[PDB]
């Protein structure tokens, strides 16, 4: 069986995916999201979310859905043979539109674990009392990125580890660290200058970092792992532009878990008898946001992806991870309890916070053909089984049949069930993750020059639509 | 069937004597993938389906079902009446079923 | 059902003249005279019908006589017959024996030529299949026991019910047809039905203004404005005020005809057998 | 890799011109029409239940055509070819006269006759059950295939985890598919439902179907299965009209909505039962409308299986409600008396059925190439296991050490010898298994269906007298 | 509550017709013999034609 032997190495998609000269334009309309920047406003009695968390420090992982090209109808009839070939989309252009004005938005904690300002201290103050927390706010480090792949991105953060079963651990001991790899989901917080760490687990204090990140994981994209994966599916190309400087040098109150060795200093006297806390922490500050340093609102043409998957959108899917903290202005809107008053009163006005993001994604796809011979079939199967399976290529009808029984009123009583509880067939394993599912099944258009990215692509390629009107040019 | 204090339908009404008007929905042929697609120019042509054949399957066994009213307005059987009946009092209704 | 094609809710305040099946309903008969005389022949281009009935029992009606018998139609009696019995007769209908031979269904119907001018063209990507079948109306009577302990039958122990189950399965063979829209054909189609052209194309520099709609995420929450169904969209089906049994065949099309009973029936009718791949037979 | 799109048997199955005739001698069956008789202490069946409304699902067993010794086997090569039987003709002979038998219940849940009521029904009491009989719906059918048929009926399902079920609630329905077996009751005009579960009354339908499951053949699913094995031929006739219109008795489980009628007063204050049921009746039976006693030539099957009897098997399902005459017997307890006494005679019921099947089988050769082998293996694996070809012998030899004195107490226990034969996948089902292994004959001229086939094909017999 | 004297009963019947014809034009060369024959058949025919 199988005259050829399995290919032992990963080959580039330029070897079995044949590219055609048919291009399509797809685009979302305009994606808005209003919410609270620091926490979700839940009900006092129920835990239904009334105003969700929509901040500028969040990952925005869009899960683009493309139409199945094995069920389309291009200006052809039988250009592809459905018994030997199968079609697939290849992303050849992207543009991540952004809507709101540039700006920086601060956050903070009403009770932040800050002892004193160790930047320029006047003298030696007494030791910490009880509940030495202040209300401190800070603007985070500035970040922009754009990951594009056909599989979800992959983050990294420091979590808590399980200490070896040889040490005797006492309460209050330092939790061991371990670098955890997790898929980035829409709504994960991007690191802010305090590190890529688990803040719920590693800081039981709940009072060291600001409100938006005090009980959440801050992840960083694992480029080392994402570019070194064999098939290169989760990263076609990426951009990143981070910047930060330390604004204020602070301290941290609490029991010194690990004391300064008596070798590194000379024992003091008087007011300097007990060492001030040497758990320093800086306040990040992402500096000036400018318009010339923007990653977005520009077209990005994929000439050659980083890995071996050269932009092929396997499984009719595509992921656009987007972070930018350069449009993160929280709008401060208030309301009046009574309009009858003619003087001012701090107890008369109830203040609120909001944040509104605006996106608009446009793409340019190119139809591709994969003539599924024997060895190409074995390769596509070993790379990803659900690829070769979710288009039913090498399958006969099973001897049983697929005659469903559908009831016309499936909510009513006295028909046995809703009849579809178990997710047995075609359930993508991303059941568990939450993305900004974008449905581009009704948005493809072969009229390229009618859309802004379409005519940008036409310019870059050097083409133009054939004239509908006769002479009169220029 | 509906629970009296609410107004939600628990069991709908499904008799043999109703119209079954099906509203089929066909795929848009101008957005389809055929063996070949460039057979019709999208700028001066359009596609459409035509019904060439149809078959309405039916599953249950043959049979006649009967219905009726628990209080049906009948006075007397006038097919063959032995003699003159009495006079109509109040509420002379009867329970009578019939195959349609 | 044998009681006329009338509106029983408004024409009979008695609420007791016809069975519970059509006590407050409207009994409608297909208007063949009007559906056939339609200019374009869209509403129907193929139909079958069987209907049989005989008068089983002959009855009377109780109530105040609405129109008296004219006194020159009968000779006045005296005694018991001094007051007239009600002459408002109504027959109890009866559809006779059902048979497997007289069946209209479970058979393929090849629409070779339609009745009107629309020769089977499903305009607007739409098809309507109206079906009445009073030959499978068996109502299954089923009961439940409120007490499984009792070993003596008691009418107050068993609760009786009535049920009915329909089973359908529709199969079609569609044919792709192409229409070259010149000026003449375009104006003729715009005269026939403007929605046809308004649904494809051919005249729309779509707006002069943008048509980009900005959709919100988490649109159930109370942090935004009013994002729920308030302004309408091109959602306007002209048949939205009507309730049909919807059937979505958008994902059920298949060019492998010989894989389905009606597909290979159509092949066998047209000859047109599939090409044998397996060597020699 | 291999293939899609199930293909007709006319592509890999090559026909020959060798025809054989096989036929059962005569199949008789006597019994009781309503219920099976059994001893009080035991449960051995003394007189089975042989009704005219049961399915007769014959499982025919054909001889393996690969172990036929043909004189010149040079027409097929057992190294690369295998043989199979194709059913070309069939006749389902019926023996008894035309007649209609009736069934009933001594305690049937019937309140009154609501066809034409002379006055509003009086009070309802306890146990208004009557003794009512009825002749059922008329039915004939004959399904033939290489797999058992598939039936359909409505059954009780489990309700959701949403509604609190009170005692006496209506059981939810569900269309359940099953294999039709020999002795399953055909639908009789009361529907295709599970009367054991859906009616705890045990008094709503007559005696022979009050505990049974009336099934209907599922043609929608049998013709739509991919390979077309369950049936490749079927005929059916069925007629029924409503003879009488009745009423039910019991606590009304669903009240009539108050906006359908106008409340009564006095005699008509309590609503009479609105649960109706008609008694079916299959009218005149005729010899002109007979499906059976006729030869059927299976030229073009309905599916892709053009009459190939895979696995040397054939299932003939038959319903004949046209010869359901139940004969009423009687025995005298004492043969001395000179005066009639009802206590002197023991009344009985008996029903006798009579069948006679005949088939004309055509021999066909399947040349097993690689793709034909893969296709047949995907379609059915027990085919390529029944025919010695696949499963090439993976392992090698291994010593078993064969202890000499196995029943001694100086060694361990040598016991193994474990397996009982495990072959039959259709062992759970009950069919009227017909064995045609010693009944094949190449002399079609000598059998009635054989000479009918010869006459229909032309092909007169070779002359022997000058 | 239902009362017989509360409801008046009537009977009605409605017919529905639709007549369609296909007519063909015919010419009659009115010679002497044809005119005499039509005058013997029906003279109002020869009258309504003036």
Rounded CA separation B61/A353 (Å): 66
- Does the beta-carbon distance from B29 to C176 stay under 8 Å? yes
3-state helix, strand, coil in chain A (%, to 5): 10, 30, 60
Residues of C in contact with B95 (CB under 8 A): none
Rounded CA separation E38/E50 (Å): 14
- Does the beta-carbon distance from C221 to A51 stay under 8 Å? yes
CB within 8 Å of B62: residues ≥ 6 apart: C98, C99, C100, C135, C136, D137, D238, D239, D240
The reply to whether C140 touches chain A by the CB within 8 Å rule is no
Consecutive H or E run containing A93: strand A85-98
Bridge-based pairing of strands D327-332 and D345-367 is: antiparallel
The reply to whether B59 touches chain D by the CB within 8 Å rule is yes
Q: At residue A90, what are phi and psi to the nearest 5 degrees?
A: -120, 120
Task: Count CA atoms within 13 Å of residue A297 on its CB side.
Answer: 13
Q: Name the 3-class secondary structure at A92.
A: strand
In chain D the first and final C-alpha atoms are separated, in Å, by 62
Q: Which of residues 1-20 of E touch B (CB under 8 A)?
A: 1-5
The reply to whether A405 touches chain D by the CB within 8 Å rule is yes
Rounded CA separation D451/D123 (Å): 69
The reply to whether A63 touches chain C by the CB within 8 Å rule is no
The reply to whether B42 touches chain D by the CB within 8 Å rule is no
- Does the beta-carbon distance from B37 to A79 stay under 8 Å? yes
State whether CATH 3.40.50.970 applies to domain D9-382.
no
Rounded CA separation D201/D250 (Å): 10
**Sequence-ordered strand ranges (E) for B1-100:** 20-25, 36-37, 45-58, 66-72, 94-99
Distance between D272 CA and the closest CA of chain E, angstroms: 16
- Does the beta-carbon distance from B25 to C135 stay under 8 Å? no
**How far, in Å, are C103, C167, D300, D310 from residue B56 at the CA level?**
11, 10, 23, 31
- Does the beta-carbon distance from D4 to A395 stay under 8 Å? yes
Nearest CB neighbour to C133, from listed B58, B61, B77: B58
**DSSP per position, chain C:** --S-S-BHHHH-TTS-SS-GGGSSSB-----HHHHHS-SS--S-S--------EEEEEE---SEESSPPPTTSS----SGGGSPPP---EEEEE---EESTT--SSSEEE-SS-SSSS-SEETTSEEEEEE--TTB---EEEEEES-SS--S--GGGEEEEEE----EEEEEEEEEEEEE--HHHHHHHHHH-HHHHHHH-SS----SS----EEESSTTSSSSS--SS-S--TT--TTTTS--EEEE-TT---S-GGGSHHHHHHHHHH--PPPP-SS--
Distance between D101 CA and the closest CA of chain C, angstroms: 19
Q: Name the 3-class secondary structure at A455.
A: helix
Rounded CA separation D309/D364 (Å): 10
In chain B the first and final C-alpha atoms are separated, in Å, by 22
**How far, in Å, are B77, B97, C79 from residue B90 at the CA level?**
18, 22, 22
- The answer to whether D319 and D56 are in contact (CB under 8 A) is yes
- The answer to whether D153 and D176 are in contact (CB under 8 A) is yes
The reply to whether B36 touches chain D by the CB within 8 Å rule is no
Rounded CA separation D5/A393 (Å): 11
Which residues sit opposite A219 in a β-bridge?
A190
Nearest CB neighbour to C137, from listed B17, B20, B54: B17
Nearest of D193, D227, D190 to residue D383 by alpha carbon = D227
Give the tokens for residue A294.
Answer: 């923007």
Rounded CA separation C103/A66 (Å): 46
Q: What is the DSSP-derived secondary structure letter of residue E6? A: G
- The answer to whether A380 and A388 are in contact (CB under 8 A) is yes
- The answer to whether A88 and A71 are in contact (CB under 8 A) is no
Rounded CA separation A233/A151 (Å): 6
- The answer to whether C246 and A63 are in contact (CB under 8 A) is no
Distance between D85 CA and the closest CA of chain B, angstroms: 32
Distance between E7 CA and the closest CA of chain B, angstroms: 11
**How far, in Å, are A125, A371, C123, C183 from residue C187 at the CA level?**
91, 44, 16, 6
Rounded CA separation D290/B19 (Å): 34
Rounded CA separation A253/A161 (Å): 25
Nearest CB neighbour to B39, from listed A70, A76, A409: A76
Q: At residue D220, what are phi and psi to the nearest 5 degrees?
A: -60, -40
The reply to whether C66 touches chain D by the CB within 8 Å rule is no
Distance between D174 CA and the closest CA of chain C, angstroms: 9
A and E make contact (3+ CB pairs below 8 Å): no
Number of DSSP helices (H) and strands (E) in chain B, helices first:
0, 5
Residues of B in contact with A414 (CB under 8 A): 10-11
Task: Count CA atoms within 13 Å of residue D155 on its CB side.
Answer: 15
Rounded CA separation A374/A376 (Å): 6
- The answer to whether D128 and D204 are in contact (CB under 8 A) is no
Q: What is the DSSP-derived secondary structure letter of residue A452? A: H
- Does the beta-carbon distance from B20 to C92 stay under 8 Å? no
Q: Which of residues 244-273 of A touch B (CB under 8 A)?
A: none
- The answer to whether D182 and D210 are in contact (CB under 8 A) is no
Q: At residue D270, what are phi and psi to the nearest 5 degrees?
A: -80, 125
- Does the beta-carbon distance from C259 to D6 stay under 8 Å? yes
Taking the CB of residue A257, how many other CB atoms lie within 10 A of it?
9
Rounded CA separation A366/A444 (Å): 11
The reply to whether A424 touches chain D by the CB within 8 Å rule is no
Q: What is the DSSP-derived secondary structure letter of residue A420? A: -
Distance between C184 CA and the closest CA of chain B, angstroms: 13
- The answer to whether A153 and A61 are in contact (CB under 8 A) is yes
Rounded CA separation B87/C83 (Å): 9
Rounded CA separation D438/D445 (Å): 18
Q: At residue D377, what are phi and psi to the nearest 5 degrees?
A: -70, -35
Give the tokens for residue A224.
Answer: 């080392």
Consecutive H or E run containing A190: strand A189-190
- The answer to whether D358 and D90 are in contact (CB under 8 A) is yes
Q: Name the 3-class secondary structure at A87.
A: strand
Residues of C in contact with D175 (CB under 8 A): 165, 167
Tell me, in Å, the resolution of the deposited structure: 3.1
Q: Among all residues of chain E, which has the CA nearest to that of B75?
A: E4
Rounded CA separation A21/A365 (Å): 10
CB within 8 Å of C192: residues ≥ 6 apart: C40
- Does the beta-carbon distance from B89 to E1 stay under 8 Å? no
Residue whose entry in the numeric block shows the structure tokens 């340093």? A293
Nearest CB neighbour to C95, from listed B59, B88, B99: B99
**DSSP per position, A128-181:** P-S---EEEEE---B-EEEEEESS--EEEEEEE----TTS-PPTTPPPPEEEEE
C-E C-beta contacts closer than 8 Å = 32
- The answer to whether D51 and D34 are in contact (CB under 8 A) is yes
The reply to whether C159 touches chain B by the CB within 8 Å rule is no
Which residues sit opposite A58 in a β-bridge?
A189
**How far, in Å, are A13, A88, A368, C21 from residue A18 at the CA level?**
9, 10, 6, 64
Rounded CA separation B32/C255 (Å): 12
Nearest of A174, A165, A169, A164 to residue A201 by alpha carbon = A174
**How far, in Å, are A315, C29, C43, C205, D250 from residue C32 at the CA level?**
51, 9, 10, 42, 45
Rounded CA separation A392/C256 (Å): 14
Q: Among all residues of chain A, which has the CA nearest to that of D161?
A: A417
**Which pairs from C42-46 meet CB under 8 Å and 24+ separation?**
C42/C116, C42/C118, C42/C123, C42/C193, C44/C115, C44/C116, C45/C111, C45/C114, C45/C115, C45/C116, C45/C118, C45/C119, C45/C120, C46/B54, C46/C109, C46/C111, C46/C114, C46/C115, C46/C120
Q: Where are the domains of chain D?
A: 9-382
């Amino acid at each position: 069986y199988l005259p050829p032997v399995p290919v032992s190495k990963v080959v580039s998609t330029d070897e079995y995916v044949a590219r055609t000269n048919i291009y399509y334009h797809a685009g979302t309309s305009r994606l808005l999201a209003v919410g609270h920047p620091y926490f979700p406003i839940k009900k006092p009695n129920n835990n239904k979310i009334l105003v969700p968390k929509v901040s500028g420090l969040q990952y925005r992982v869009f899960r683009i859905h493309l139409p199945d090209p094995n069920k389309f109808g291009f200006p052809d009839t039988s250009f592809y043979n459905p018994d030997t070939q199968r079609l697939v989309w290849a992303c050849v252009g992207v543009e991540v539109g952004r809507g709101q004005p540039l700006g920086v938005g601060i956050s903070g904690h009403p009770l932040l674990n800050k002892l004193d300002d160790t930047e320029n201290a006047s003298a030696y103050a007494a030791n910490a009392g009880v509940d030495n927390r202040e209300c401190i706010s800070m603007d985070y480090k500035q970040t922009q990125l754009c990951l594009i792949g056909c599989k979800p991105p992959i983050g990294e953060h420091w979590g808590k580890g399980s200490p070896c079963t040889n040490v005797a651990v006492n309460p209050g001991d330092c939790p061991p660290l371990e670098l955890i790899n997790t898929v980035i989901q829409d709504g994960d917080m991007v690191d802010t200058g305090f590190g890529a760490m688990d803040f719920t687990t590693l800081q039981a204090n709940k009072s060291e970092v600001p409100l938006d990140i005090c009980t959440s994981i801050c992840k960083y994209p694992d480029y080392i792992k994402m570019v070194s994966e064999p098939y290169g599916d989760s990263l076609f190309f990426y951009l990143r532009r981070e910047q930060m400087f330390v604004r204020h040098l602070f301290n941290r109150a609490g029991a010194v878990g690990e004391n300064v060795p008596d070798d590194l200093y000379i024992k003091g006297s008087g007011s300097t008898a007990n060492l001030a806390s040497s758990n320093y922490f800086p306040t990040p500050s992402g500096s000036m946001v400018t318009s010339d340093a923007q990653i977005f609102n520009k077209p990005y043409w994929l000439q050659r992806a980083q890995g071996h998957n050269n932009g092929i959108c396997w499984g009719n899917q595509l992921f656009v991870t987007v972070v930018d903290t350069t449009r993160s202005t929280n709008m401060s809107l208030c309301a009046a309890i009574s309009t009858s008053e003619t003087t001012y009163k701090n107890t008369n006005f109830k203040e609120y916070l909001r944040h509104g993001e605006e996106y608009d994604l446009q793409f340019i796809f190119q139809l591709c053909k994969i003539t599924l011979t024997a060895d190409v079939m074995t390769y596509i199967h070993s790379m990803n089984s659900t690829i070769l399976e979710d288009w039913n290529f090498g399958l006969q009808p099973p001897p049983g049949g697929t005659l469903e029984d559908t009831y016309r009123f499936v909510t009513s009583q006295a028909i046995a069930c809703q009849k579809h509880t178990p997710p047995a067939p075609k359930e993508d394993p991303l059941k568990k993750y939450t993305f900004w599912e974008v449905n581009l099944k009704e948005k493809f258009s072969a009229d390229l020059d009618q859309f802004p990215l379409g005519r940008k692509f036409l310019l870059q390629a050097g083409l133009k639509a054939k004239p509908k009107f006769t002479l009169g040019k220029r």
